[model samples]
Target: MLKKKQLTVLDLHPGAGKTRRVLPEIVREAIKKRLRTVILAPTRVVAAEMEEALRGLPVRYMTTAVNVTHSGTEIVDLMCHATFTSRLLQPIRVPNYNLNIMDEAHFTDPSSIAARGYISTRVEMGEAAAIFMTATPPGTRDAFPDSNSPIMDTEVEVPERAWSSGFDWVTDHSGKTVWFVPSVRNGNEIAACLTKAGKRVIQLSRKTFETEFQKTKNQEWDFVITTDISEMGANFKADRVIDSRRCLKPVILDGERVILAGPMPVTHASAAQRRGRIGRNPNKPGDEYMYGGGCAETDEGHAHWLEARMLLDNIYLQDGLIASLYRPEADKVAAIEGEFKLRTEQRKTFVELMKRGDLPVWLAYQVASAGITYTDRRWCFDGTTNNTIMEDSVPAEVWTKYGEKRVLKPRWMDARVCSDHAALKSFKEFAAGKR
Candidate 1:
């Protein structure tokens, strides 16, 4: 019999539906045990998604108790007004409930106003038993810089190995690529043309209202041609997604077989999401292609700074390394930072990690104590406990130097460990001599 491993925060994946499936079960089980549970989601969309999944389940009463904890539409009957109540608050007068499930719990940075609110509220209300759900959990190194305290301890179900096994199936099913030219000139025209061509196509844009967009999405389309709007939610991952709109570039996601566009960061995210479509459902493999020409100048500076940020941040960047022809000056950086209202310390922490080929895992953890920081886009000490060869591999000297209780524990070297082989190799080497 296969050994049943206990769940860890390490195993979760947001895209694999594991969180979606288990969240409802957790709520149901909590309800069955008569535990008044309050579930928190960082975004209204996630909260709504959870709500929809839980609807009509055997334990529908839990829905009454469950409420969205973020900014969103107010549900009158639930008396859950869209108030920015402290996330730390226990539902008043709701009996016997002692558990709080903080969805996307990585955001609970002690320094963040939101995190402060949540921490204070939880402490004041006297709540116990908290389950923080996240595909990416904040590490001890990041959360509590000076001390090692468990942020949220409970169960985790990550099926990445299982999910990755399904990738071969995804690539195999998506057969050869085919390109279709639409008679229409722009996105709207192309969407109509594709629809007329008997392809499932939806033309979405900022102009397309959310309600109308959903109604149109309910109908089938072969290809979806739209601006930025369709890139995110359309969920139309047919064999191919074509974008004829000249102003807009084509993006390829994981599941998307092909995208026709120039090499751009916006194009990359779009393509990534498109490729994400592949191997998603029906378990199939697929190919992705990007097309660029016709006024698509390869020269830089036309793209936005965020694109530059992603490019510099890309770990897999081999050929397309955009030189910092335009590094923002201090004033410019300050202006941009202020525009985004970013913390100066966070920016300094990120640059420090980028420069130091060897950083403490705890430092990486500290810099990204807030959930939004993209550690995956930067390098740092190996944070994965199982991997030993990391440059920052918990060295015995450092272990003894720091007075670590356990000198032989796995450590990760960088945040972008998922796809980087070099980083993995380093970790493996570190593991060889360890116990």
Candidate 2:
């Protein structure tokens, strides 16, 4: 059944030639099935490059359908022509699409705009055949995979030369350390050192937005520190990822020299992201370091203590280093408390409430069905009790009574109420034929 579905991982060498070789196979498969396959790539450049490779593949000999949808000329055209008047009122019934390939499948986390669209589309219209091709799945794994079942079926392994290799070294900073601290404070401190060492430093900060980043196109800055915003977006040069406090997680140190200023902690998904980063780096001999300091301990000792355990476990177990890092009973750590466990349990329980409820269902269905009917105008909410009735004008007091935060503001709410009431009253009065 799996083979019939053609759901298999492609374990190929990392090179331009390998990418070229896979393109033909994808085209052939699509042609064989007469499938209207939509190939989703990680970036506009990748999508365009892939599209060029697939064009003029002589698929006419085979009976299949094919289309590419990433940020490209073709997709741009599709978007422009997708207006309400031009779009089909009903779903376009086609023979069947053999394959729908999502390159960079690992990025299907909901937090990402691309992944949100990707997942929602898949859920709304189940694909005849689909492919998720990403070396790095973004964010937490649980966020991407459905709770009902596992998403991945298989992983193909390749030879050593096909893979990138490296090490993450740690030290207490008495000498040259490979693994650095992971905390933000530690990372910033090390970043300062690197900056002072005649090396320009650039850090990812939360304040950095997409628009702001664009402004820095022609400029450069010394080491900057922020969050994961710089991780996947544009490419920039960096000496290494110093773990200062493990604040950024273990993967941040994978390809780069990880300085564990405090401790070396890792997360499962973070390990994967780290490994992927290292693999992508053309440079060799990537390093990681870990540093130790009593002052690094948080004032909230218990909270930091628990987090330390998670950090260690994440790096050791989740990073595919269990055999390499985990110790026996001699290295036993404290057990998780009931309160913490229950709190986490409760959080997971409610994660899907919105997705499963009618509000989301109705909204998704409405958007997909009616489409964005009011693109120019905003949605108007009356904030009234008697929704069916047509009155002279519903007062704002009705909604304000609900509570301050709960109450809808007068301007926005009054406009909606008055507009709705007037429209309904006009229609009903006209229908009565009593001028």
Candidate 3:
């Protein structure tokens, strides 16, 4: 616990007393050295549970609800992941803690906003120990770069709950339950159906998440309906979970095998986490009725999401994030080629649009590079704007539809251009008029 200099991941089956044994001891050790700790929980549920467990310790919970700031007298500054990331962005304070721990690391998002915040945290924490606590650790360290992962080999048993193909199964179980749906629409529909069927149920939505989750968790409601928000660390102490909000899609990391239980969807690693919710109280072991949705998220989703942003320029990345996000050169090349193959047909339309004055040469190049296609012109569609006019190069003994020989090579007559929004705006306005 003390020797780690950089990043490390510790994995154990769910409910293995990580908070019981490991966490307290780590805090004790930190206190001995007079160092402080910052713990980022994936959700409010997680942070709340940690507080309950660390009752005797001087842990300060930082939340919008907390009426006071830390007095620097506490040993731990515990907050949800969102708070930690936002505070970093707000430049509220510099890195003050000596130890950083991310509970349920697998649930973290790799999105431009969330993921980059993590990268930035590490950047500021330079050389300070960072620990990622997860149950199902990823297979590849592509994202972590230089990190160590120590895993426990034992598996904790979970009670198999009553499960059936469809909603009909709901009728079979009468105990306290958690029913997971995929969307708000589905949540409302299911809640209403169960309500009419005489099953006391409440659906949690964007507006009613906290209110309903508390009701369900408190056992006031026998059956509770929820969306995917619950999957990310919301622990409901129910006898069984009727999970429908899921995708069984295979996920991979760094183009390899599943880092999560099949790359756990970077979106998923979740279903497993969800199942863990019930089986938590080892002695009062709970059951999980899995059926609503089988689709599991894998890192493959993250990979595709990245490719989408890379292709669309729809992403906004902050400092030091590009390195954590980039892929192998070969992987990038394939990403570009696949996207281009499907959308390249538009090139003809764009060229036509250019020649007819509907699209200027610069505008045409912008469209081509927006980007669906690229050749070995050492050109990339990312962060670059080149006013390239296609002109024929080297001659070949080939004929056209008119039987014309001397086929010329395809080449781009590229001139200087730019990256800022102003540059792109200039091209668009110029294309819109004669200026």
Candidate 4:
């Protein structure tokens, strides 16, 4: 009955025992069998949960998720998927783990630095195994279904959340809750409001989040505020879950809906994953709510929502934005230029800007990963670029209010990086003087 190693996909519904019951048990057995395992979760927050799940057992702990170079040959090396991704370019930095557990496997699609590395690079031996667990597996039968089609799973089809104002929901709602915010700004504003309302809240964000959040395990708390950082594979106890980010509000503009100027529509894939945060136990019901809920209720209308996200994603692919990650093809680059309507001279200029690397690698990654709109507001990006003492880059009102207190006077490179950071590189020289 002994067999060589194999690959498998564990597709279970949210509440099922995939993570809770199976993962640690598998690790314990793997250890006894003398199997070297590399457990990779999508983010530090999720990885933290994994660390908790298997804490009693022996495992390599968290390094820095975004800036990890840990090639430790520990018995069970649990790390963030971001750390595992960097090995694509430099496999020398990674240790050989015959058995790999890719938690939240959907993130490893093409744009991700992998699919090629998972097998060829990791496994030196012919006998190797890959175990992937994710409810939303990315890929189609034809493989690239560019068209809109619906699929079903074991979960309920009705994915509706009681959409409302963040302030309104929290102030009125009772019981221990998990409020998933979109960013640090949102986390702070709401954290302040929640405190004034006399509710005990532990707000988690980029700055000092690790130190602040660790306090929660020892303290009794009412609300644990967070961002998308905790979206996947996090086990937070709650009677209700409030997603503080607004996806697409059901907007019927003329005949077709326009993305216009606001937040992107919710990919039901992500939306569903968020809902799974609650209702962990059987026989107990869970309620989910949105920050600005106005998504279509009907399946057909929701179909358009899903279709819209796909169209947007495809647009980037066509533009060669995603393809540019690894070296893109000539025709694909041509496709991008043609669709973008760039003149030959104009294309050259754009190409030069990127090739020359105008911004610092860290800045470029930050701006490229998030967006300019959110970039300026962040202390990480803004603090790194702007002079803490001289640059009057911030707003006059708050800048005046804080009297330079809000300004980061050489905030360490560490502060500029977010908790859910995906990009590599670190807070050095730029953020720290001679640092």
Query: What C-alpha lDDT values do all the predictions have?
Result: 0.33, 0.30, 0.48, 0.46
Better of 1 and 2 by lDDT: 1
Q: How many residue pairs clash in each candidate?
A: 52, 61, 15, 5
Specify the highest-lDDT model's number: 3
Q: TM-scores across all candidates?
A: 0.34, 0.36, 0.57, 0.54
Residue 198, model 4, lDDT: 81
Per TM-score, the best of the predicted structures is 3
lDDT tens per residue, model 1, 1-435: 001111123224324554467766776676566564555544433445556776754332223335544333221111111112211122233332255555554332111123322322343344445454544342221111111111111122211111334324222433322222221134444445435544555444433435445544477534444454433323433454332213322222232111224323232223333333333443443333223212222122222222222212321112432222122111111112212222445544443443342232233333443432433322222334443332443433223222333323333222222112343443333333221
In terms of lDDT, model 3 sits at: 0.48
Q: What does the lDDT read for residue 252 in candidate 2? A: 16
lDDT of 2 by residue, 53-123 (tens): 66655422111122533433221111111111112111233223345455444331122222222222332
Give the per-residue lDDT digits (tens) of candidate 3, residues 79-179: 87656644543324635566777777665332222432343344344645666676655443321111112211122221123222443646677677776
RMSD of 1: 22.6
After TM-score superposition, the amount by which residue 392's alpha carbon in candidate 4 deviates from its true location, in angstroms, is 6.8
Which ranges in model 4 have alpha carbons more than 4 Å from their true place? 1-7, 28-35, 43-52, 55-75, 87-93, 106-128, 139-169, 206-208, 245-262, 286-291, 294-433
Query: Model 2, residue 117: what's the lDDT?
Result: 28
lDDT per residue for candidate 4 within 1-435, as digits (tens), equals 012356566766665667667898889888888887878777666676676677667778656533334345558887666455434322135655667887776452222324323342223234567676766553311211111112211221221232234436455767677776545555667777668778798876543556666756778888887754455566666666666334322222332222222344344445556555666655454344343343222222322232222212222222333222112111111222213323334333332222232222223333333323211334332544433333234421223222232433322232222212221123222222211
RMSD of each: 22.6, 19.0, 15.5, 11.9
